[PDB]
Subunit: 157 residues, 3 copies
């Protein structure tokens, strides 16, 4: 059988650039405020993968009280999430990630996001979709206040 | 063969307390349950049976005073009647406050019982918008849900 | 052997109605500001179907640098996206679309939308779901600034 997972993440702008989206450093006037590297795309993708194994979420797997992964970048977190999913029997069906930002432009950076995700999951490029949209200057993303990301995943049990 | 559905719901605060989320009454310091409403829409969507509003209109007096678990169970009855069984569900609550985490285990249990499925087929999480937008400003709460049905 | 996709689209209100959603014209005091016809629903659906095929999004298929499909309505883009998807060996599992709008009223027009989608996708009506929700007067949709739409898709490989 197959299993569905969903992830959703939001960070507000603040501090100095650059931002890091899908493992890719992107120059911007502002950074993204977060407890770690603020990678909304990898954070949402990890939640979607973990969800499709009902492992709760990032917060459950890497809690307050566990020093092991404190200060770890999102790719480190993604890989360890994967390792722990792959060992529960699951293999990868496919993923689709949707970044929601008015700015910066994401389009030129998406190719390398896809490469980094494929590497971290040990899968073909063909199993990884990443796209970006604006909200036409509407809402807290449209006004340039933060970045949101939605992600969905299908795993084979 | 499997089938995908999606749900999204929003509840505005009007006296802001208490609220009911995932069948759990939470002190904030229809019945407005965004989690179950979005989960129901997702299951009904996977079954191409429309949404909550299509099955139980506000105009129809027959479900006046029905809570979200009752609509969830009735929705699931009609889905099973069409030959579907559960794969799994993933629910994501979007709220600046109140704190959902202590109540999530209970929500999960309520959903598993209502759908007659294993706990491991039910995933519920909560997250914030970091003080951004209507949820971030404390105006209301939202929920995104997805579901996979079988055959 | 199934594959998942997700799509998300937002257009703002501007100038004059009617609006067009799911291929159906709906009377409203405002129209939708868009490069194309502004069909949020068909645009989200297309992105979801393409995402499942790892073919990115409509922008990747139909840039504004490209003359071929310039000025095409959304139904034509969907049928073309669908042609390219089917060329990779994919067939339709099922689709589910969620329109997020305070107004106008969508429900009376939804059966026709489903008819139009099933025809464009060459599938049974049983494989197409379309729902609509308000945001209880909250956010940019609730205040009537615009309309959003989300969609999910399963393809079979
Ligand atoms: N933050 C963003 C948003 C959109 N884009 C690009 O803009 C194109 C059209 O976006 P939109 O539908 O919001 O007008 C997308 O295909 C592509 O992702 C981008 O590069 N960075
Ligand atoms: N734009 C909209 C929004 C909702 N509706 C209708 O209202 C019902 C309930 O929506 P809500 O719970 O957000 O008030 C929907 O099931 C149905 O689609 C509509 O017809 N047009
Ligand atoms: N309204 C909320 C939001 C988050 N939480 C909890 O906070 C943790 C992290 O949330 P966030 O990503 O917004 O910082 C979640 O794992 C958990 O659900 C909560 O209890 N109530
Ligand atoms: C799944 C979700 C949340 C999708 C929509 C993302 C988005 C652009 C939210 C905007 O917030 P807002 O409309 O509340 O901004 P504000 O009320 O400040 O206009
Ligand atoms: Zn994050
Ligand atoms: Zn569009």
């Amino acid at each position: 059988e197959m299993r569905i997972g969903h992830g959703f993440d939001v960070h507000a702008f603040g501090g100095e650039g650059p931002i890091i989206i899908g493992g890719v450093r992107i120059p911007y006037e502002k950074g993204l405020l977060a407890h770690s590297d603020g990678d909304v795309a990898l954070h949402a993708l990890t939640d979607a993968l973990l969800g499709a194994a009902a492992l709760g979420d990032i917060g459950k797997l890497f809690p307050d009280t566990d020093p092991a992964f404190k200060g770890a970048d999102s790719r480190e977190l993604l890989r360890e999430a994967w390792r722990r999913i792959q060992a529960k029997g699951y293999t990868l069906g496919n993923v689709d990630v949707t970044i929601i930002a008015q700015a910066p432009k994401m389009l030129p950076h998406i190719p390398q996001m896809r490469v980094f995700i494929a590497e971290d999951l040990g899968c073909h490029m063909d199993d990884v979709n990443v796209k970006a949209t604006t909200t036409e200057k509407l809402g807290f993303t449209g006004r340039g206040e933060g970045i949101a990301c939605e992600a969905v995943a299908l795993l084979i049990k």
